[PDB]
Design a protein around this ligand. Structure first.
Ligand SMILES: O=c1ccn([C@@H]2O[C@H](COP(=O)(O)OP(=O)(O)O[C@H]3O[C@H](CO)[C@@H](O)[C@H](O)[C@H]3O)[C@@H](O)[C@H]2O)c(=O)[nH]1
Ligand SMILES: O=c1ccn([C@@H]2O[C@H](COP(=O)(O)OP(=O)(O)O[C@H]3O[C@H](CO)[C@@H](O)[C@H](O)[C@H]3O)[C@@H](O)[C@H]2O)c(=O)[nH]1
Ligand SMILES: O=c1ccn([C@@H]2O[C@H](COP(=O)(O)OP(=O)(O)O[C@H]3O[C@H](CO)[C@@H](O)[C@H](O)[C@H]3O)[C@@H](O)[C@H]2O)c(=O)[nH]1
Ligand SMILES: O=c1ccn([C@@H]2O[C@H](COP(=O)(O)OP(=O)(O)O[C@H]3O[C@H](CO)[C@@H](O)[C@H](O)[C@H]3O)[C@@H](O)[C@H]2O)c(=O)[nH]1
Ligand code: NA
Ligand code: NA
Ligand code: NA
Ligand code: NA
Lengths: 361, 359, 362, 369
């Protein structure tokens, strides 16, 4: 019956759910807080695995203006009905931005989980890069995964007292599933060098993804003992490009999206990871897996500077060369093996929330 | 199978539900009547065993809300074959529902009729709501002789006014672990504060008075169940959340709230209902307003106005904790302000006399 | 360019328009004020007095009271805010007057009530007009009472004396402003003017009144009646089916206000259930027989200007006979010199009350 | 038939229309550009005076979330239908924010007129202070009125090449009406002010409604009682609550002329005749010093710190004793008066801001390497 700080948790996507799950679990266990989940949008599967129970699903997530209009227009009512005291948004989504704005309209304070990631390339990608900069102005409190991300927030006028370097909750999430099976994946990878590849970014759809698929095909032809596992993003155009280039190759296992527990176990077994995923750039180095990044830019410069990760873009010759170097030269491999925190990020977020909103002078 | 007088019961809020619950229970138990509940709260419904036949999901601009109730309440009143409609208190629901009932020529009774400050449109719209309901209602259940006098001054005929007392006393009587652990062996002040006209700075001054009293009196405790509004929660939380002597609470179930009030040494409130409940438990009340609709407790010395002046609140709480003669002067037995706890039965007999009789 | 008090004027019916017209004209002429008309429902009355509505809400019509009141409460706020209304005036006893007063109160726009304090003392009779007056009375900051009796009714409902002004009735102002087939029909004959519209008298009671007209016509070959019919098909049908063959009765369409007042001036007496005609007819020295069991104009009853006759055909025949046959009974129902309902300066008295309340500082 | 850069101009209010009008006129006159006006929201009167012709009026206007939702949802269609290339928004309005976002959603680049004004008080006022910081992240180009405002933009991570110190277009707007004596005349205002010391007062901010405005009105009443020769002209913001507070405190005082909103030409002429100006208006803080009129600011904070630092303006809040004292000092002591008009500093620009905006637009969007 003691007053709990009621913390709104608003997300629409898998990566948001994975990164918020450890914060939800910490808020649930602590008697000083009550998490209240509102979804805007694979997700049931993540909710089941971590035991997340949404109070409300807005069935909103299509033109960007129409989607943002609906969230700005409609999120206020459930936030008020659920007596939310403070709202947490995560990452770079149009949900995170529109929900932060909707919360601000009701004078509900906002906290941003995973604050301060920047490429320095204006509107690239769109709208994610501008979403971060808008959320940054709306948020009272910022949970930065790294010192570099905290620096980016100060350069946009955020006061140092509003910034906590908590590390990234994705490390917490990884640790939760590492201390907890898939027959077909085990049978396919057992006793083989397996490359794990994920690729989903809209700016790479069609021809650039086709080049990456051609690089995979070439590596498979040249290296009969090499295997690839490619869990496919749930978009029909992404599935069609990989399927049409690779479905006949016995050395490639094209997969449905994997449950996070199975995905992390697979990543642990992989010899290296090719990805355009932000989260996988954080997860893979933590498991000592070299990462080749299928983009021209990254929001994770820490991995680049430490030699954990290299940019490879969608150039098939460079991908073939760089994967070859790592498989053939054990010194190049070892040169690519904490950037993103220790796995206590949820507890550091909780203590920042308690200090800001459960304290009086 | 004998004809029952079907009594519409319309409310949208906790205070209405608490005050109507004893009337609903009396109507349910009496074979001459059938209560029909329409809402415009689940926890209060569960506690008293109230089962709404219809929930209109209406409760935003005042004009839009009143428009919806006037427009939409008629259909469920007609569908449920309501004979007579009861509304309670001062809400825009009570006013708009009384009007919607009048439009269908359904006679209206007003529970807790005739409370006045004498300050026009203060608060708005509650003060005007009472005066509009007063003209719409055929029958008025006044809690006190003073309230009956206010009805006569607005042209209500004496035969349409019954001094029933307040059903909140009935409600208290019906309901009579972390809270126990926090209060056991300590002087505990119970504080509630919710009025829109006190939001922000005035509530901040009251919270500062609490902080000062806590610093000066290490043995003093406060329990503050917070009104479910984020701005109210924010002011108390930001002023008091670090003070070990203050337990900030979620809204309490009515049974738990009344038990806490019984254990408290005194009550600070801007609540109308708590001004009626606290004196009935012999707890001195300091009223966190510049006006009250409960002048009876003021006149009898049960209650004193303190407003949102932190110096006056500190002084007045100090007087009661330090001077046992000042304390006893606010509990003197013998004078009954708000009724005996038989208000539901007196309402039922007024309903039977008016609408279950023939000349 | 000096600030004007912007006065909302809200009405939906002929009687409201007639009684508000002199106040609108006074507000228009005075530089301290700007009238803003919003209608809920009349072109003919607007043309005659030069009233120009800024907004017509197309709300009124066969419609439920709750649906109409819901629409006015819901929708009148927007034009009141858009037109920057400072204060709102409503008139009389209509559901428009009540719902508009409430809509204005919701936007914290102060309300004034023109023709405040009329009471029968019969609860919900008629419905909803009697309750509308008592609701408007609680909502209004300022009350323009036509008579001392009406002011007394307001004090008995808890209104402070400082909020009540005895202005008289603006219908006298309206009459004074307006002061061929009808001429051809009435020339050389004693003509009774009859109007009857009240919903509580529809069907059988109106049929009894029509039978009384028929009986008077049969017994008095020289007597004529002119009956302008309220625009309701049921009212038209009852009079038409009882009287359309009688050469002594002219059933009429509603008359323009100027023509109606001229006809009333020519009439020997008036039979009506109209509130306004009970005020207009005595001012022209015409005895009034009131086709109701109650009146909100007790002043005319007490002064002998008017008598209640209800819908009893024997009583109507008797009372009309007495007035036509006995010039002493006729003269007893005329009081030239003395005024029941005001002097025809009610608009100016309203304006000065508005200036005192809302265009003054301590 | 040569391609013009089609520049969307979106506003809903008088202050926006006044500050955008000189940019619209410069875009209209230059053959390289075509202004396209879309309104969201007194305004006809400003449109007539400057010859602004809106292509679309949205009639949106109420809860902030509902209004912002409607602009984000519905402004895209007219922007696309009118083939807008670039969008300009002005100031701190929820229209400016929601329109900038709606433009960004259609990949229409945004320029912000009057960029970089800051109090340093988070969410004060709400939502204007956050609107500026959101527009700042959305806009590709920023027209800062002062070097101080440009400094505030760089501290929020704006690249120097995206910030131009143009000055404030309100000075351009003033200059456009100063040249028009015939249109600036008003019989009743002339009769009231001719041969008298006249104080001009405007006050509209929501955070001052009710009690604070009442204190300001009491200060006016006290100054009037103490100084029988003093006059006040108070054009009232079109809000019934604002009108009621001034009317109920001042309507009987022959020394106070309460007015309907004045046409901008007449308002600037009145300000030129006034001995001093009391205001919570942003624009009047910029206009008054340009006419050499000391300004007392009826707020606890300002986004025009330049006028405070240069001694052109002083914060007076809504404290009636301080207002009476400060107005008294300026009327009674010609040295105190002259200290608030000292020459040697131009705070808000020279009245060439529209031309500097145009040249920034051409360099950014009408150039190839
Ligand atoms: O079959 C799969 C594939 C991936 N993952 C997990 O999914 C996450 C990443 O999902 P993805 O859709 O690839 O999104 P990201 O690109 O990682 O995330 C973007 O969106 C996030 C939310 O806005 C931001 O935090 C990031 O910075 C941004 O890169 C990682 O934790 C993976 O382990 C699975 O569980 N199963
Ligand atoms: O944590 C809490 C706090 C209060 N209460 C009860 O809630 C009621 C008071 O509710 P509150 O929201 O404070 O409203 P009031 O101020 O009491 O009531 C207003 O509204 C009522 C309905 O219109 C009117 O009868 C009153 O005169 C008017 O003051 C009382 O019965 C309390 O015992 C609880 O059960 N739990
Ligand atoms: O052909 C006709 C008949 C009547 N009238 C005039 O119409 C008005 C009366 O209209 P009516 O429809 O009879 O309404 P009333 O019964 O007079 O008015 C009711 O409605 C008004 C507004 O609510 C209240 O002021 C009254 O007290 C109430 O009785 C009077 O001024 C008449 O002179 C005409 O102009 N032409
Ligand atoms: O009767 C009058 C009174 C004022 N004005 C003019 O109106 C403008 C002021 O408008 P106002 O409504 O007082 O708004 P401001 O407070 O000046 O403007 C706010 O809103 C603008 C748009 O977001 C921002 O540029 C400003 O920083 C912000 O302070 C000025 O140019 C005045 O000269 C008139 O034309 N007539
Ligand atoms: Na918890
Ligand atoms: Na029963
Ligand atoms: Na006028
Ligand atoms: Na041009």
């Amino acid at each position: 019956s003691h007053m709990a700080l009621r913390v709104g948790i608003v997300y629409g996507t898998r990566p948001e759910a994975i990164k918020l799950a450890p914060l939800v679990l910490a808020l649930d266990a602590d008697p000083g807080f009550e998490p209240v989940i509102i979804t805007t949008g694979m997700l049931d599967e993540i909710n089941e695995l971590f035991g997340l129970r949404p109070r409300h699903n807005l069935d909103i997530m299509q033109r960007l203006s129409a989607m943002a209009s609906r969230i700005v227009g409609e999120l206020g009512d459930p936030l008020l009905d659920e007596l939310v005291d403070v709202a947490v948004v995560q990452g770079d989504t149009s949900t995170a931005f529109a929900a932060a704005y909707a919360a601000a309209c009701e004078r509900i304070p906002v906290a941003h989980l995973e604050a301060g990631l920047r490429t320095g390339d204006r509107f690239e990608p769109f709208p994610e890069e501008i979403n971060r900069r808008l959320i940054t102005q709306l948020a009272d409190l910022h949970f930065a995964p790294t010192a570099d991300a905290a620096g980016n927030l100060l350069a946009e006028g955020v006061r140092s007292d509003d910034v906590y370097v908590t590390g990234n909750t994705v490390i917490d999430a990884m640790h939760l599933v590492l201390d907890r099976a898939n027959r077909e994946l085990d049978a396919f990878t057992e006793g083989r060098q397996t490359v794990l590849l994920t690729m989903h970014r809209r700016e790479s759809w069609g021809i650039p993804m086709g080049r990456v698929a051609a690089a995979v095909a070439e590596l498979c032809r040249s290296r009969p003992t090499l295997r690839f596992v490619i869990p496919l993003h749930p978009n029909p155009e992404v599935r069609r490009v990989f399927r049409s280039h690779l479905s006949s190759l016995t050395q490639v296992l094209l997969c449905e999206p994997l449950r996070y527990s199975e995905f992390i176990r697979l990543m642990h077994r992989a010899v290296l990871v090719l990805t355009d995923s932000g989260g996988v750039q954080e997860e893979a180095p933590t498991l000592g897996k070299p990462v080749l990044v299928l983009r021209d830019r990254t929001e994770r410069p820490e991995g680049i500077a430490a030699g954990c990760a290299r940019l490879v873009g969608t150039d098939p010759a460079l991908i073939v060369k760089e994967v070859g170097r790592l498989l053939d030269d054990p010194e190049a491999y070892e040169a690519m093996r904490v950037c993103y925190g220790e796995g206590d990020a949820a507890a550091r977020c909780l203590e920042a929330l308690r200090e800001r909103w459960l304290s009086s002078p």
